[PDB]
Design a protein around this nucleic acid. Sequence first.
RNA 1: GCGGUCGCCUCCUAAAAGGUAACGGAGGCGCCCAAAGGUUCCCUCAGAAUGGUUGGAAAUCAUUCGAAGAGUGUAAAGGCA
RNA 2: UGGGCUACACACGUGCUACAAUGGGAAGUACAACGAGUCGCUAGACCGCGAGGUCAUGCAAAUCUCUUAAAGCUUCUCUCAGUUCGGAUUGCAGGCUGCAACUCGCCUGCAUGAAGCCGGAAUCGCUAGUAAUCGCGGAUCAGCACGCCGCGGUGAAUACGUUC
Lengths: 114, 177, 82, 80
Amino acid sequence: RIAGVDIPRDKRVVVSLTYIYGIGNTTAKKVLANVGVSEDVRVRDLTNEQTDAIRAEIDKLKVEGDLRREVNLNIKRLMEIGSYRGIRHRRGLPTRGQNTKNNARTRKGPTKTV
Amino acid sequence: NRLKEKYIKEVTPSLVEKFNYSSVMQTPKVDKIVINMGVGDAVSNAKNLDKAVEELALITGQKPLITKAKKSIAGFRLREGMPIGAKVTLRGERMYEFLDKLVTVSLPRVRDFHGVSKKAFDGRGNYTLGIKEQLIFPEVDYDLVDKVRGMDIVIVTTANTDEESRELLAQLGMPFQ
Amino acid sequence: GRSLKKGPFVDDHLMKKVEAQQGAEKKKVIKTWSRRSTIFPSFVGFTIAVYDGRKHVPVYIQEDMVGHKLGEFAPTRTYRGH
Amino acid sequence: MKQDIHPNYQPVVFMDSTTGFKFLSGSTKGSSETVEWEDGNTYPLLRVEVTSDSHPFYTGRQKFTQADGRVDRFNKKYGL
RNA sequence: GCGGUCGCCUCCUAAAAGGUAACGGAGGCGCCCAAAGGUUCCCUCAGAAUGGUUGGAAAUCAUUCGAAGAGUGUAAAGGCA
RNA sequence: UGGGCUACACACGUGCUACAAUGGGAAGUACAACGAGUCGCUAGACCGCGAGGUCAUGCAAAUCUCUUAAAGCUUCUCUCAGUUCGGAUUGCAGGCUGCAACUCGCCUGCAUGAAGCCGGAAUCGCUAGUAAUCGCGGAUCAGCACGCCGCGGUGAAUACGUUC
Ligand SMILES: [K+]
Ligand SMILES: [K+]
Ligand SMILES: [K+]
Ligand SMILES: [K+]
Ligand SMILES: [K+]
Ligand SMILES: [K+]
Ligand SMILES: [K+]
Ligand SMILES: [K+]
Ligand SMILES: [Mg+2]
Ligand SMILES: [Mg+2]
Ligand SMILES: [Mg+2]
Ligand SMILES: [Mg+2]
Ligand SMILES: [Mg+2]
Ligand SMILES: [Mg+2]
Ligand SMILES: [Mg+2]
Ligand SMILES: [Mg+2]
Ligand SMILES: [Mg+2]
């Protein structure tokens, strides 16, 4: 659709935009402000011209594969230089300094009873 | 017809010059193109092969021949004659038309397309390109695909050497690395 | 993070050592207890033996490593597993 | 070619939207839009944003900036 | 006595026709096929190398090399490109 | 001086946040109490999306400030969706405090968007301004609380009865 992802049709335009990777609610508000499109109108209602203007704004923004490639390079960079954060990333542990005696399940994964 | 036109006009004299051919008959030409889609998933469900066949037919403009496993293999749960894998053969106008479409449209729509391999040659002047995913062809419609898949396109030419093959494919347009 | 106005931080003794060795054909390992000191483009290309709490571990500095504190590149505690 | 067993095939023109370069070739897909063509023949028209001419690799120039080094980033941030 | 065997097919024993014994050495049969029969037309294998998404030693595809090293429902011998 | 007490295949206790519509978001509007304050509380103004920053004012305080509290009420929006719920993890970019924030601080913006659809055996608190729920202050304290101490706002259900 807009940036290579088929955004939901019924939802309001701001929410449908958020469905794009790299775009949050604040960014959707900003791009709609630039294009002049109202936030309430649904995307299905949006005219083809409004959709084209929205495409221009998103293409100005970085999203989807471009954003994902950038972040993966950063993480790869940490791991390759062998930083403490890189080791955290490699071993799937909290990078941001949380304690790992308890919790940490998000990084660790499902519990292993052993 | 554009690609045939390009071939006969520019490519043919240019290859003649570079490779010092005594008679134009010596000019290598794309003899045929065989697009092969190996579907091992058919064993799990034949409809995967069915949909793969449909997508391939849309891509090629010809109904594919459903090749069958010549030998039963217990490793892949494969029984002899199982209809796994399809192929289509294109010659002449259809061959040139599909090749030109590949050069222009299908190739760019590949994710992070860095060009095509430059070593995938058999050593006789015949090349093969491994397309990892469909949806690059305009006829797939990016939604009809329930399970994404790939394919292998075999360009068989009259060239004796990978060098003449490489030049011909480059002249017709091939984003070699 | 560190206030932009404050600028990057580095221990003066470490900075003086790297400065003295800037005009050096072959870099010699600089031994530092200073974990806090930030890496600098000048630090690039040097081998620094950073104390980890029990010994100085050498690390080769590169433009890729710069922008980070030295101490992060020397792990403190070891965890082999269970 | 056997009859009534092959997917419908029709000649179709292609224009690169970004640059307008035109090439005529057959395809299964049909476009409601149609354009004329030398030899006085009309064909359905399929507009494509990216083609060989449009693609940077064919031209020999690349749009991408290739990102920034961390040394340069550090100098820019700290005014050094 | 115990064990084994009892009819039929193939090989070796069998001594270059045929035949030829032993509680000699090896195996098979008590069917299967509505095409796996008849005929007309058409085709040629197995493997190896190189290249190639999933795909891996090995699935399907392409070129070359390849006289049979494949196949011939079912044992072996004979035969068949 | 540096590191550790902050480790992390796992087990448990105590809490916070949720799983949504008695809700989420946006806008408007109203009502407290206990307490703290001198290099401390900081008005007002300006810049900043924000965390904050600059100038600068009053107050050793029933005088000035922290301090217009939040639930609440009124409109608009969302329409039962792992979602406009959820806010973990992660990337980048910042703000402070401090000689110094990698090990290892809190906070902000953007981006990402984890498990979670009300929870087995079992088990806990509470009889009224109580439980439930909502904020506010303070001690420690350069900085740093989902903990502790205290304050107020809204405000229920049930008690037949003593067999267990
Ligand atoms: K920790
Ligand atoms: K716990
Ligand atoms: K027959
Ligand atoms: K315990
Ligand atoms: K807690
Ligand atoms: K509401
Ligand atoms: K710290
Ligand atoms: K405090
Ligand atoms: Mg998004
Ligand atoms: Mg901590
Ligand atoms: Mg005889
Ligand atoms: Mg005889
Ligand atoms: Mg037969
Ligand atoms: Mg402790
Ligand atoms: Mg629900
Ligand atoms: Mg009581
Ligand atoms: Mg209360």
